Amino acid sequence: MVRRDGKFVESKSRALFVESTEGALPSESDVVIIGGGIQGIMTAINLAERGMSVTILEKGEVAGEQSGRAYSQIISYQTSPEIFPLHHYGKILWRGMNEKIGADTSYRTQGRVEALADEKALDRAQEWIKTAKETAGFDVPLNTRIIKGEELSNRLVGAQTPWTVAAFEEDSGSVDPETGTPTLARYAKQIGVKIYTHCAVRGIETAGGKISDVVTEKGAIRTSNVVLAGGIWSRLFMGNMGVDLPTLNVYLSQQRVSGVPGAPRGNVHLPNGIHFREQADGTYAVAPRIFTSSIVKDSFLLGPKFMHLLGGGELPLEFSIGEDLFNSFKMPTSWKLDEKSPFEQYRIATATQNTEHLDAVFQRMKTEFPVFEKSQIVERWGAVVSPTFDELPIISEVKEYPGLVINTATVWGMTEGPAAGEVTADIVTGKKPVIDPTPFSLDRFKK
Numbered sequence: 001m002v003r004r005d006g007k008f009v010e011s012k013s014r015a016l017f018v019e020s021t022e023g024a025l026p027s028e029s030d031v032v033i034i035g036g037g038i039q040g041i042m043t044a045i046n047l048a049e050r051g052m053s054v055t056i057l058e059k060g061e062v063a064g065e066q067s068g069r070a071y072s073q074i075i076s077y078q079t080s081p082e083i084f085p086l087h088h089y090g091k092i093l094w095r096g097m098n099e100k101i102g103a104d105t106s107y108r109t110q111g112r113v114e115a116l117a118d119e120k121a122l123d124r125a126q127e128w129i130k131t132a133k134e135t136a137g138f139d140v141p142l143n144t145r146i147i148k149g150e151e152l153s154n155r156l157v158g159a160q161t162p163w164t165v166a167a168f169e170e171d172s173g174s175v176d177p178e179t180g181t182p183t184l185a186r187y188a189k190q191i192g193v194k195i196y197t198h199c200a201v202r203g204i205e206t207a208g209g210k211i212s213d214v215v216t217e218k219g220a221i222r223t224s225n226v227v228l229a230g231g232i233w234s235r236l237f238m239g240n241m242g243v244d245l246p247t248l249n250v251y252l253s254q255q256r257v258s259g260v261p262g263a264p265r266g267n268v269h270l271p272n273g274i275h276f277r278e279q280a281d282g283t284y285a286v287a288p289r290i291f292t293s294s295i296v297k298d299s300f301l302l303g304p305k306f307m308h309l310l311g312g313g314e315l316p317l318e319f320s321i322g323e324d325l326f327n328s329f330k331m332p333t334s335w336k337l338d339e340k341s342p343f344e345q346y347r348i349a350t351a352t353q354n355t356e357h358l359d360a361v362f363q364r365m366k367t368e369f370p371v372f373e374k375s376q377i378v379e380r381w382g383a384v385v386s387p388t389f390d391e392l393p394i395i396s397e398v399k400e401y402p403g404l405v406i407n408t409a410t411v412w413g414m415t416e417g418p419a420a421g422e423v424t425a426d427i428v429t430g431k432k433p434v435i436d437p438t439p440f441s442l443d444r445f446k447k
């Protein structure tokens with residue numbers, strides 16, 4: 001039967017609290033950034049370090065939404081050719097991040113073992129590793145290989161299933177999302193970025209093809225350069241300017257369980273639906289296999305491109321239908337800049353957690369690794385993501401509105417954030433980007 005429990009709700013941040021910059025909004029800024037997630041913040045840092053004045057506006061709290069809620073494995077494994085450099089260089093930048101900011105983001109190089117279920121999986125793993133090893137950029141080699149026997153069994157200590165082979169990304173990363181983006185926000189503030197929380201951006205004023213200001217709920221700020229890094233809210237923001245972003249929301253759930261003696265370390269991914277990541281604080285992040293699509297207005301508006309999230313393919317997908325459906329039609333898609341926007345109602349949006357999903361993955365984890373019988377649940381939460389239909393982010397200028405640049409629509413933003421932040425800064429400043437952004441352009445959606 002069809003579920004009725006998936007719901008979009010207002011919530012609170014689960015990430016470390018970041019104080020707003022003191023005082024009034026500035027009257028002008030060289031660049032204004034909409035959103036205080038990892039993309040807004042990493043973009044701000046790259047621009048500030050180039051000597052520009054930068055202001056971030058955040059309707060709720062820093063890392064209140066996706067960036068504070070992520071499973072947060074930092075990996076390149078099985079990425080496409082267009083995406084791989086973003087992940088490969090993301091990892092490079094993360095490895096230098098604590099040094100850069102003189103603080104601990106919680107980033108750790110920990111390694112990731114993915115058990116492979118059969119020869120077909122093994123074939124696909126070896127094929128990707130072969131090509132990635134040959135094409136790895138930025139004068140840094142890939143450190144991903146196949147392992148087996150004694151080596152694998154000790155990596156997967158106490159495992160009840162006879163796993164024989166696995167892809168091992170030895171330099172995979174981990175960052176605890178409660179810690180990472182907030183600590184980067186603090187660094188941003190130290191280098192002169194101004195961050196104003198509880199401050200929604202309603203829209204952008206422009207004429208003659210030049211942006212003149214952004215309008216917030218607390219006043220306007222003059223600028224000719226704007227970055228929209230609004231996460232799931234980017235589509236809605238752009239719809240009010242007559243531009244369509246093809247993104248569809250998906251609901252997820254996550255948890256933390258306590259560490260136990262004799263548990264495997266680092267990052268484990270098994271094909272029988274078991275995925276955990278040891279955190280810097282001793283607890284384990286645990287991710288269920290499944291996602292839910294709550295049926296809403298945009299499910300019909302974007303459906304043809306998104307059939308892999310709406311019943312086609314064999315992704316682990318569950319439909320849900322409820323209050324969301326009717327609310328999605330009541331959600332305004334345009335508003336004047338002098339009236340209240342939907343951003344001022346859902347300052348810290350999330351989805352209701354699915355307890356059944358979280359219980360099921362944890363039980364599967366206890367069966368496969370009996371030491372976790374003595375582990376208990378530390379924390380549980382829900383989250384919303386909003387990918388494009390083509391497995392590519394939107395990192396692009398907006399031709400219609402010179403001065404506007406978008407950096408959004410990724411489900412790998414923890415990994416990509418540092419790299420995407422630099423690319424976005426390059427687009428803003430007119431520098432030849434560190435990674436060619438053609439594949440991430442809005443041009444791919446025209447005609």
Ligand SMILES: Cc1cc2nc3c(=O)[nH]c(=O)nc-3n(C[C@H](O)[C@H](O)[C@H](O)COP(=O)(O)OP(=O)(O)OC[C@H]3O[C@@H](n4cnc5c(N)ncnc54)[C@H](O)[C@@H]3O)c2cc1C
Pocket residue numbers: 034035036037038039040057058059060061062063064065066067068069070071072073074075199200201202229230231232233234237252253254343347348383384385407408409410411412413414415416
């Ligand atoms: C369950 C889950 C697991 C994940 N696991 C991984 C993983 O293992 N590895 C990985 O790399 N990535 C992962 N991600 C992805 C990563 O969390 C996101 O891609 C990334 O956080 C996106 O960052 P962002 O800055 O674009 O968006 P967000 O973090 O959502 O930031 C957007 C911010 O903009 C604000 N905002 C929006 N509109 C306005 C406005 N008009 N005015 C002012 N402020 C506004 C919002 O309040 C929000 O704080 C996961 C995500 C989820 C949900």
